[PDB]
């Protein structure tokens with residue numbers, strides 16, 4: 088029957104010429120290929136500036152305890168400067184076709200996670216992107232604050248241990264779980280459907296596994312090879 092699986096470019100479309108994880112180029116290239124969404128990772132600096140980067144440390148600097156001034160001139164793998172979230176969102180605003188899959192990274196206390204989530208929602212709001220921005224996090228305190236602040240927004244849990252029923256009760260609108268969790272709990276995708284929630288799986292790059300997850304009926308696949316997933320979905324729709 089009909090596949091209902093859409094493609095999320097993990098860290099943007101970075102496995103392509105001139106691109107880099109979590110970059111302006113990767114966001115642009117995700118849009119250029121027509122992916123459903125582009126995922127990116129967000130930290131709050133010591134001085135409350137939101138920046139875009141996966142790892143907790145960049146070139147020996149721990150992002151969450153450093154000021155933005157210490158970090159601002161550090162370069163990505165393609166020579167771009169470390170993006171501010173504001174810069175990321177200014178570019179995303181002109182890219183109309185694409186959903187923004189905003190991962191808030193885990194912060195150092197529950198209260199700091201709440202602060203990072205509040206400031207994230209404020210930035211998304213002032214940049215006029217609340218309609219196109221979905222939140223994901225490993226951190227439960229961050230997720231709960233996004234749910235509280237944005238009851239009509241999409242919020243999915245990353246960490247893998249809560250059933251869809253448990254997530255629905257907390258006000259989540261989806262799960263976004265490691266593929267092995269969904270292999271270990273093969274009924275959770277169906278339960279999400281029954282519960283009116285979305286299912287997302289990360290980070291799936293092997294073609295046999297993409298097929299397995301599409302067969303299971305995941306709403307989204309988060310991948311470092313987004314064009315391969317698109318090809319597979321196109322061939323299957325023939």
Ligand SMILES: [Mg+2]
Nearest residue numbers: 088089090323
């Ligand atoms: Mg079919």
Ligand SMILES: [Mg+2]
Nearest residue numbers: 126127128190
């Ligand atoms: Mg991420």
